[PDB]
């Protein structure tokens, strides 16, 4: 049984915590729920930590008083098909392997499944750790609660004796690095300096051995990623997001200065040895658009190359942890502003960006976003109970599972079937354009070896490579983005038509150049 | 937002609560969750209460940290047919009127329905208060959450100006008395002496005017009827039960001394 | 009404039958249920048959006393989509036509459907008889009971006047030969010598005119394929299987000598004119792993070519009826041991194997097989009845239709949805790797004409052809195998990664060789 500690004693040294804790809705929640600080209190001074207190980061620390939210979070949506590869004819990107050739995603890229699995899925995907980590057996893939209890309760490491990234199976990659983990867990929140920069007080950083870092991490999507444990108020903890919104002053809604001001973020910095160490972003309001944008964004979390000179940009560089915080039509400019690209296409040699799940940036400017709707309205609605205390569902899943609460409450003119039909109209239309964009990209890509072998000049190949960048960007955004156009159908339409235009331009350029070589 | 109070100061006078609270699973739960004792602490001595502190008896006091248990409790089972009279050919006792003739149950005795309604159903049944109390309208009969929030949020009193038990409709009875309420609520747990005996410190007792008592009561089946708020440990609070089991030495299982 | 015959009279000459019949559970079942032997008994001698007795091979011969088993067998699973071509984007092998080009399966290869249809489906598939046989009309495709009553009750022959294999429609093949029928029916069990070898007493053999043979055959999957009609004990009748397990001494579980000994097979030979003629394999136990392995295996049942010198191996050769009885990683060695391959790829010219439904060999060594689980546990479980005499369901179908009896009885920790999710995780993962294997095989195949035309040497082409063999084998096993990895997910994973490795090696070899030619 827990025994309370005297928080006044802590507050003597922890003024920032005092100011948060005493004012919020956790003012009566004793520190012992999450911290074991006995030896810390015996040894600390006002500027030196002394013995490190233990801080609980398990979600059960919150589930004791918030079982409803915890249970809704950990529910596994069995209809979210697991380990479903996107590069197949029946999934999101039928020609993905040809289009992404040269990139680590060619090894495996599955559709997302329920949040409980995020950390385990990150660890076991074929592109991440060379196949080092596996579930203990193939039955464990169902065990959401187990994954939440801790990744290492359900996973095995092929070689606990080594800590290097290497292939354990031939068709795997070792793309994982420490930045990835920031969107899977915040178990490292006290051990990682802001942005993963080198820091005396940080156990882990962008340049750490990711296998060793992995072994230290257990829990997915900690509840405190969106809720300050001290004030219980809304926040974000993701460094990349704070950096974009606050440090770079882009604001929470870069396209709406007024909304950015009303629904803003306040950066709170915590120090170690009186030197800035870590930060959180306190939100003005409980704005799930910004909470979900901690992870559902396009980002860099990887080494890459400079657009200017093609030189390597390694994990040690700040750019290896970066939120572009730019919609699809501002993205090329945002990548130019940091002088960065992700990979060279294996066939065309083009410098290309790699886009990932840009839901937050896609949502900006959509009809729903403009009308003050937020992710949670459709994906974590309040529960409707005939007789019950209302709480917010933490199931984070498609509104198809709860259309009454997620759509039909606003769309009184529709039945569930009508609303589903509206969704399907958009997704079907968008998917048709994605498929057409891929057809044209693939047609362009296939001409590169023919052009090279026909003696087409490097100048013409480079012209086509520049078009490839744009054709790729304006296509890939939409296979990366999870709503298949729903979050912003007009933007998807304009973008995908732009992709096709670019590819058609490249096809015509290469075809003409090949024919001119043949004629000469 | 709640501000915690200095529980150690309470414990200077409240040794019994200290021994329960500091040992159980509510040792970290501050008194401010259930008591407003500011003026009490200002005026009390260990021998004089001073200002009476306020104690929350609402189930929301527990639902804050125990929403899953509260929500399962308050759910209304619509399949438990409401206001279904047992003295009919299709219910439990087709000849009940003949057999029970001379007893107040002849006026109305329905099947039970979900616990959320126990106090409101007690107040509105035809045999209890002469028809004095009704739901605010016939729609309110569905409102389990409302009844749990408080009986008087969903009921009306035909005559707030009188406190006597009398018939307001011809075929009703006034069988209710203060003892009934002990199986409907424990909102009176600090205002009722053991067994409802007369007591200088008891606002209410077996001989109280039941209508006046009724008006003071709000919540059905308080969570603390089975769970001690201080220790979080299992308990009962019903005097009649404690009297049988302990005072009369019958034990919890009168047919099984080992159990 | 049947009238019993005096079996003692038969037993005077039929000692093997006496020894089986008098001891088993059919000891009270009179011969007249299945044999009309009146004129036989009048004319036979102890060594000469005299008039041939009639033997009933229709399944109704057993259905009279075993209606429950018969009815469960003949049920048509309408959810098993009929005539569903595998070489489409929504089926098992999207790039099958490119990959299998040169082989008869390019004409048509559908997913399997319910067992009642096996013989009719064999007769009507476009790759088998040149389109000679059709259902009487398109309505008859539903008639499982009709097919079971007899193929010729529901099919028509385009030309009853000729018996040659030829095309009746342009896009058909004539791949059928007599060996195929051994996995469709055993109506010929008394007319076919062991292995289909030439024999004086055999009406049919490997070299027979298959159209004439076809016309003599009526019933699918006779009940006596797994149950000896005389002893009622468990057996197999399939020559290829007996030959692998017993003649070649490979055992029923080639990877487990102990299990092979406990769950073994005893070959029983029957003679004609005191010369070995046909054989059965009596099983030590009712082991469905071995019963189903009569057909659900990789086999040769076709002409092919020698790996050594490329010469034709015709139906007359023993190798035209062969069970490799080898898992995917032992298969290349098993094909080398008989010096055999199936076809030359139409584009690459590579000698290639053709793999078919190797469920039995894939199942070996899997977690379930190692734990003593057998096909029937998942595909023909005992019926569960609140009040009823239990019998074994003969419906032979996916456990999805009976998850309570097929999985959940062993997997108490799971709900049906969890178990289905576990299956889908494996199938989704495996299918993603199949698709990737095909992508790489197709990329390799497409380089062959480019390499040939660029002047790449035969030595380099032959190197790539040798890689093609392996890339093909380690892919095709898994489109052939029906569980999409479920029966052995680790093996599927290792194999498919091997396929991709081989293809990538071939792509790199050919690309480099083409570029070197272009540069010269
Ligand atoms: C000892 C019980 C207890 C623990 C442990 C606890 N909380 Fe709370 N929490 C409360 C109470 C009490 C409230 C106030 C409820 C109210 O009045 O609305 C609260 C309020 C909240 C709110 C609403 C705050 C607001 O401003 O609306 C959030 C979000 C919350 N808690 C999250 C968490 C998270 C995340 C954890 C785990 C780090 C956690 N809590 C741990 C008891 C707890
Ligand atoms: C910590 C980073 C992170 C945060 C914050 C986050 N997500 Fe996710 N989300 C993921 C990852 C990772 C997955 C895929 C998990 C997996 O496949 O194992 C995912 C999956 C999902 C899915 C697919 C679930 C399914 O059934 O397939 C939805 C919908 C989703 N997120 C919505 C949201 C919404 C809405 C928010 C804000 C309330 C949110 N997410 C916050 C990382 C995050
Ligand atoms: C900005 C936050 C963020 C970073 C950094 C991030 N992810 Fe994710 N990850 C997500 C979200 C959101 C999802 C679910 C949406 C989706 O998959 O499209 C996801 C899904 C996944 C999935 C399940 C779907 C799939 O792709 O197979 C895996 C595996 C995964 N991430 C691995 C990685 C690896 C490896 C890294 C580092 C190279 C990484 N993640 C970096 C946010 C992030
Ligand atoms: C991706 C961000 C995110 C994560 C992670 C998160 N929540 Fe929440 N939570 C929300 C949002 C959004 C709301 C509703 C805010 C609003 O509309 O007022 C919410 C509301 C709450 C509330 C207020 C009562 C209610 O239900 O509205 C509690 C308590 C809470 N969450 C607890 C948890 C616990 C416990 C966890 C960990 C299992 C958790 N949250 C994880 C975003 C998050
Ligand atoms: C107006 C409602 C609405 C809002 C607001 C909304 N989405 Fe969605 N979201 C959808 C619909 C509809 C789909 C398609 C789901 C489907 O077809 O089942 C979708 C799909 C998703 C998916 C893929 C889910 C799956 O299972 O395939 C993710 C992840 C997601 N949204 C995240 C977000 C995030 C993060 C935000 C806030 C930036 C957001 N959404 C805003 C309605 C919304
Ligand atoms: C501020 C939050 C909070 C409030 C208010 C609260 N509890 Fe609890 N309760 C807890 C915590 C924390 C535990 C211990 C959970 C654990 O460790 O298992 C707990 C434990 C319990 C247990 C389990 C005790 C045991 O020994 O197993 C019961 C029963 C319980 N509470 C009932 C109540 C009732 C009834 C009320 C209303 C009088 C109430 N609680 C008020 C937080 C609260
Ligand atoms: C405070 C007294 C009290 C306690 C303690 C109590 N009950 Fe009840 N119970 C009632 C009353 C009064 C009703 C009828 C309520 C009504 O009709 O409005 C009832 C109704 C029920 C019903 C019928 C519910 C329905 O759907 O019709 C069941 C079952 C029941 N109780 C079981 C229990 C069990 C089991 C416990 C112990 C966990 C319990 N009760 C504790 C007083 C109580
Ligand atoms: C020992 C505890 C106890 C006492 C005292 C008690 N009840 Fe009840 N009451 C119950 C239980 C338990 C139920 C539900 C089971 C049932 O109705 O059989 C119930 C059900 C009811 C119901 C709904 C069913 C019906 O009979 O119409 C009413 C109304 C009711 N009581 C009124 C009264 C009145 C009036 C008194 C005082 C004369 C009274 N109760 C005294 C325990 C009690
Ligand atoms: C005249 C009725 C009759 C006919 C015809 C008949 N059987 Fe049987 N069969 C029996 C009886 C009686 C048993 C013993 C049942 C028992 O005692 O378990 C039996 C037992 C069996 C058993 C269980 C044997 C064992 O050892 O467990 C199988 C398998 C079987 N029969 C298959 C067949 C097949 C296949 C046919 C058609 C070739 C067939 N039977 C024809 C009556 C019949
Ligand atoms: C005589 C050879 C043969 C034997 C023995 C045999 N099968 Fe089959 N099986 C087939 C053929 C041929 C098909 C496809 C039939 C068709 O498509 O018309 C098939 C189809 C199936 C299917 C797919 C059915 C559907 O609904 O699509 C399953 C499952 C199956 N077999 C399992 C088994 C199991 C388990 C055993 C052992 C109990 C077994 N089979 C024994 C030849 C056989
Ligand atoms: C070793 C036994 C075996 C032999 C020999 C065999 N089959 Fe099959 N056949 C099967 C099994 C098992 C299935 C069902 C599993 C599957 O199709 O993958 C099957 C399925 C079929 C199907 C339905 C699915 C499809 O491919 O369209 C046809 C048609 C078929 N066989 C024709 C043939 C022809 C023609 C031959 C000879 C060239 C042949 N079979 C030889 C066992 C065999
Ligand atoms: C592919 C092999 C196979 C075929 C063909 C087959 N069965 Fe069976 N049969 C089994 C297996 C396996 C069992 C159960 C053996 C065990 O577990 O004891 C079984 C059991 C039996 C039993 C024993 C009683 C029972 O239900 O367990 C009878 C009778 C039987 N089958 C009759 C038939 C009849 C009649 C047919 C033809 C319609 C038939 N079988 C076709 C494999 C076969
Ligand atoms: C532990 C249970 C289990 C065992 C044992 C098992 N399988 Fe399967 N089998 C499966 C599952 C699961 C599938 C995939 C079915 C699905 O996804 O609907 C499958 C698929 C099949 C299919 C394709 C069925 C269809 O409709 O798609 C055939 C044929 C098959 N198995 C035959 C066999 C044979 C022959 C054996 C014995 C050598 C065997 N299986 C052993 C569980 C089993
Ligand atoms: C006769 C009992 C039995 C049956 C039937 C059975 N299993 Fe199993 N299974 C086991 C045991 C023991 C292990 C270890 C295991 C292992 C597994 C594993 C982990 C395997 C691995 O490779 O790590 C999965 C997934 C699984 N079973 C699913 C199923 C599904 C799905 C079915 C139904 C098609 C099923 N099982 C049928 C007993 C059984
Ligand atoms: Ca990116
Ligand atoms: Ca073969």
UniProtKB/Swiss-Prot annotation, chain B:
<feature type="binding site" description="covalent">
    <location>
        <position position="13"/>
    </location>
    <ligand>
        <name>heme 1</name>
    </ligand>
</feature>
<feature type="binding site" description="covalent">
    <location>
        <position position="65"/>
    </location>
    <ligand>
        <name>heme 3</name>
    </ligand>
</feature>
<feature type="binding site" description="covalent">
    <location>
        <position position="183"/>
    </location>
    <ligand>
        <name>heme 6</name>
    </ligand>
</feature>
<feature type="binding site" description="axial binding residue">
    <location>
        <position position="227"/>
    </location>
    <ligand>
        <name>heme 4</name>
    </ligand>
</feature>
<feature type="binding site" description="covalent">
    <location>
        <position position="62"/>
    </location>
    <ligand>
        <name>heme 3</name>
    </ligand>
</feature>
<comment type="subunit">
    <text>Homohexamer. Dimer of trimers.</text>
</comment>
<feature type="binding site" description="covalent">
    <location>
        <position position="226"/>
    </location>
    <ligand>
        <name>heme 4</name>
    </ligand>
</feature>
<feature type="binding site" description="axial binding residue">
    <location>
        <position position="66"/>
    </location>
    <ligand>
        <name>heme 3</name>
    </ligand>
</feature>
<feature type="binding site" description="axial binding residue">
    <location>
        <position position="184"/>
    </location>
    <ligand>
        <name>heme 6</name>
    </ligand>
</feature>
<feature type="binding site" description="axial binding residue">
    <location>
        <position position="14"/>
    </location>
    <ligand>
        <name>heme 1</name>
    </ligand>
</feature>
<feature type="binding site" description="covalent">
    <location>
        <position position="10"/>
    </location>
    <ligand>
        <name>heme 1</name>
    </ligand>
</feature>
<comment type="similarity">
    <text>Belongs to the cytochrome c-552 family.</text>
</comment>
<feature type="binding site" description="covalent">
    <location>
        <position position="31"/>
    </location>
    <ligand>
        <name>heme 2</name>
    </ligand>
</feature>
<feature type="binding site" description="covalent">
    <location>
        <position position="180"/>
    </location>
    <ligand>
        <name>heme 6</name>
    </ligand>
</feature>
<feature type="binding site" description="covalent">
    <location>
        <position position="223"/>
    </location>
    <ligand>
        <name>heme 4</name>
    </ligand>
</feature>
<feature type="binding site" description="axial binding residue">
    <location>
        <position position="26"/>
    </location>
    <ligand>
        <name>heme 3</name>
    </ligand>
</feature>
<feature type="binding site" description="covalent">
    <location>
        <position position="34"/>
    </location>
    <ligand>
        <name>heme 2</name>
    </ligand>
</feature>
<protein>
    <recommendedName>
        <fullName>Cytochrome c-552</fullName>
    </recommendedName>
</protein>
<feature type="binding site" description="axial binding residue">
    <location>
        <position position="40"/>
    </location>
    <ligand>
        <name>heme 1</name>
    </ligand>
</feature>
<feature type="binding site" description="axial binding residue">
    <location>
        <position position="35"/>
    </location>
    <ligand>
        <name>heme 2</name>
    </ligand>
</feature>
<feature type="binding site" description="axial binding residue">
    <location>
        <position position="230"/>
    </location>
    <ligand>
        <name>heme 2</name>
    </ligand>
</feature>
<feature type="binding site" description="axial binding residue">
    <location>
        <position position="115"/>
    </location>
    <ligand>
        <name>heme 5</name>
    </ligand>
</feature>
<comment type="function">
    <text>Catalyzes the reduction of nitrite to ammonia, consuming six electrons in the process. Has very low activity toward hydroxylamine. Has even lower activity toward sulfite. Sulfite reductase activity is maximal at neutral pH.</text>
</comment>
């Amino acid at each position: 049984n827990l025994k309370p500690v005297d928080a006044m004693q802590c507050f003597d040294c922890h003024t920032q915590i005092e100011d948060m804790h005493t004012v919020g809705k956790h003012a009566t929640v004793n520190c012992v729920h999450c911290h074991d600080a006995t030896e810390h209190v015996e040894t600390a001074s006002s500027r030196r930590m002394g013995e490190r207190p233990v801080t609980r980061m398990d979600l059960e620390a919150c589930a004791t008083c918030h079982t409803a939210q915890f249970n809704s979070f950990v529910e596994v949506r069995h209809e979210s098909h697991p380990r479903l590869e996107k590069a197949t004819p029946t999934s999101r990107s039928p020609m993905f392997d040809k289009l992404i050739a040269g990139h680590g995603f060619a090894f495996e890229h599955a559709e997302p499944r329920s949040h409980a699995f995020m950390l385990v899925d990150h660890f076991v995907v074929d592109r991440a750790y060379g196949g080092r980590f596996q579930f203990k057996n193939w039955q464990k893939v169902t065990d959401g609660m187990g994954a939440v209890r801790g990744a290492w309760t359900v996973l095995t490491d092929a070689d606990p004796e080594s800590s290097d990234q290497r292939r354990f199976l031939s068709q795997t990659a070792t793309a994982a690095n420490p930045v990835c983990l920031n969107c899977k867990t915040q178990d490292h929140i006290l051990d990682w300096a802001y942005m993963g920069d080198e820091h005396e007080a940080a156990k882990w950083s962008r340049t750490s051995e990711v296998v060793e870092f992995a072994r230290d991490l257990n829990h997915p999507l900690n509840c405190f990623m969106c809720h300050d444990p001290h004030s219980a108020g809304p926040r974000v903890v993701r460094d990349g997001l704070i950096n974009a919104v606050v440090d770079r002053g882009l604001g929470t809604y870069p396209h709406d200065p007024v909304k950015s001001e009303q629904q803003g973020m306040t950066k709170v910095t915590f120090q170690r040895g009186r030197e800035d160490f870590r930060a959180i972003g306190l939100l003005d309001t409980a704005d799930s658009n910004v909470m979900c944008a901690q992870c559902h964004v396009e980002y860099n979390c990887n080494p890459g190359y400079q657009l200017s000179d093609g030189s390597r940009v390694g994990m040690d560089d700040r750019r290896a942890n970066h939120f572009f915080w730019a919609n699809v039509f501002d993205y090329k400019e945002a990548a130019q502003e940091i002088d960065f690209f992700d990979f060279r296409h294996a066939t065309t040699g083009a410098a290309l960006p790699k886009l990932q799940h840009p839901e937050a940036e896609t949502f900006w400017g959509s009809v729903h976003e403009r009308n003050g709707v937020a992710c949670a309205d459709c994906h974590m609605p309040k529960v409707q109970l005939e007789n019950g205390k209302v709480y917010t569902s933490h199931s984070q899943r498609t509104p198809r599972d709860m259309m009454g609460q997620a759509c039909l409450n606003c769309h009184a003119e529709w039945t569930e079937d009508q609303a589903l039909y509206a969704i399907d109209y958009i997704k079907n239309y968008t998917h048709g354009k994605i498929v057409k964009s891929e057809y044209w990209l693939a047609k362009m890509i296939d001409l590169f070896p023919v052009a090279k072998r026909a003696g087409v000049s490097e100048d013409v190949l480079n012209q086509a490579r520049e078009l490839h960048y744009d054709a790729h960007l304006y296509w890939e955004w939409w296979t990366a983005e999870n709503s298949v156009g729903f979050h912003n159908p007009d933007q998807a339409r304009e973008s995908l038509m732009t992709s096709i235009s670019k590819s058609k331009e490249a096809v015509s350029l290469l075809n003409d150049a090949i024919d001119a070589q043949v004629a000469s």
